[PDB]
Each structure stands twice: as structure tokens, then as C-alpha cells.
Amino acid sequence: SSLQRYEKLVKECRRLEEELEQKTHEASDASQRVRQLERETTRLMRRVEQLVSAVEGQKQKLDETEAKHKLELAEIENRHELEIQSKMSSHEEALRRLMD
Amino acid sequence: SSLQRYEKLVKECRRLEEELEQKTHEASDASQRVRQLERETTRLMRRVEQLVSAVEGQKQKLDETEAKHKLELAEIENRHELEIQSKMSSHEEALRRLMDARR
Ligand SMILES: C[C@@H](O)[C@H](N)C(=O)O
Numbered sequence: 621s622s623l624q625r626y627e628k629l630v631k632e633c634r635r636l637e638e639e640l641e642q643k644t645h646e647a648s649d650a651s652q653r654v655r656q657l658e659r660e661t662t663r664l665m666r667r668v669e670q671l672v673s674a675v676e677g678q679k680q681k682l683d684e685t686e687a688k689h690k691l692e693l694a695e696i697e698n699r700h701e702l703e704i705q706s707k708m709s710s711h712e713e714a715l716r717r718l719m720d
Numbered sequence: 721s722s723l724q725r726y727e728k729l730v731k732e733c734r735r736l737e738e739e740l741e742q743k744t745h746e747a748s749d750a751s752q753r754v755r756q757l758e759r760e761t762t763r764l765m766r767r768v769e770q771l772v773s774a775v776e777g778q779k780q781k782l783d784e785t786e787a788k789h790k791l792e793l794a795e796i797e798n799r800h801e802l803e804i805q806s807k808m809s810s811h812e813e814a815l816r817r818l819m820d821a822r823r
Binding site for chain 1: 722725726729730732733736737739740743744746747750751753754757758760761764765767768771772774775778779781782785786789792793796800803804807808811814815818819822
């Protein structure tokens with residue numbers, strides 16, 4: 621009776637002490653895992669941020685190559701039309717000097 | 721004394737029980753945060769692979785755009801050479817006919 625009731629409560633106290641020890645080891649294991657994952661997430665968010673800046677940089681660079689090319693084309697076209705006009709001018713002076 | 725001995729052990733059992741519940745709650749919060757981190761980890765990893773693929777796609781588009789620009793420049797030079805040759809040949813015909821006329 622009385623001794624048995626007391627030893628049953630002693631045994632429950634020990635069961636709580638051993639479960640507490642187990643949960644302490646598991647909480648320690650979990651904290652190792654959270655810290656490991658937080659080091660990964662922060663490292664991931666950084667490279668994502670660098671890659672977004674990279675994509676926007678390549679997109680800007682493509683608009684720049686197109687802008688330079690369209691200008692190069694316009695300069696070439698202007699220079700060629702003036703060269704053709706120069707030939708026509710020279711031809712007219714030649715005809716004027718030969719035919720008087 | 722028998723009663724007092726049991727009641728003192730009862731209070732310790734409450735302290736341990738309450739301490740186990742606090743540790744149970746802490747483990748419950750921790751393992752939930754792990755699961756959220758594992759989800760965010762795969763979500764971020766998926767975006768890294770996307771952005772890397774987007775980078776390689778833009779680099780190929782850039783090289784082909786440069787290649788296309790170089791072809792268009794060569795075709796412009798070709799057409800200009802065509803027109804120069806046509807102008808100079810028309811001026812030579814005009815010369816030949818006008819020198820014939822004044823003969
Ligand atoms: C829980 C405890 O108080 C009880 N005496 C038992 O035997 O489990």
C-alpha cells in the first residue's frame with residue numbers, strides 16, 4: 621500500500637527525468653539543424669539577389685547593343701547617301717566642263 | 721510524515737511535468753521552423769536554377785544578335801557597292817553618248 625504508492629510516484633518522477641533528458645537531446649539536434657538551414661537560406665537569398673542583378677544587367681546590355689547598332693546603321697546610311705551625292709555633284713561639274 | 725513525504729514528491733513531479741511541457745513546446749516550435757526552412761530552401765534552390773538558366777539564355781541571345789548585326793552590316797556594304805557601281809556606270813554611258821554627240 622503506502623510504500624507501493626510512494627515508489628510509484630518516484631518511478632513517475634524518474635520517467636519524467638529521462639524523457640526530459642531525451643527531449644533535451646532532440647532540441648539540441650533541432651537547433652543544429654535550424655542553424656544549418658539558416659546558413660543555407662541566407663546563402664541562397666544572396667546568390668538569388670546577385671542573379672537578379674545579373675539578369676537585369678544582361679537585359680540592359682542587350683538594349684544597349686541594339687541602341688548602338690541602330691545608330692551605327694543610321695551613321696553609315698548618312699555617309700553613303702552623301703558619298704552618292706558627291707559622285708552626282710562631280711558628274712555634273714564634269715559634264716558642264718566637257719559640254720561647256 | 722508519510723503524508724508530508726508524498727506531498728513533497730508530488731510537488732517535484734509537478735515541476736518536472738511543467739518542465740517537460742515547456743521543452744515539448746520548444747521542440748514543437750523548433751521542428752515547425754525546420755519544416756518551413758526546408759520548404760524555403762527548395763524554393764530558393766529552384767529560383768537559383770531558374771536564374772542561372774535565364775542567364776545562359778540571355779548570353780546566347782546576345783552572341784546571336786551580334787552575329788546578326790555583323791551580317792546586316794555586310795549586306796549594307798554590298799548594296800552600297802551595287803549602287804556606286806550603277807552610278808559610275810550610268811555616268812560612263814552618259815559620257816560616251818555626249819562625246820558621240822559632239823563628234
Ligand atoms: C502518475 C502517478 O502519480 C501514479 N502514481 C502512477 O502510478 O502513474
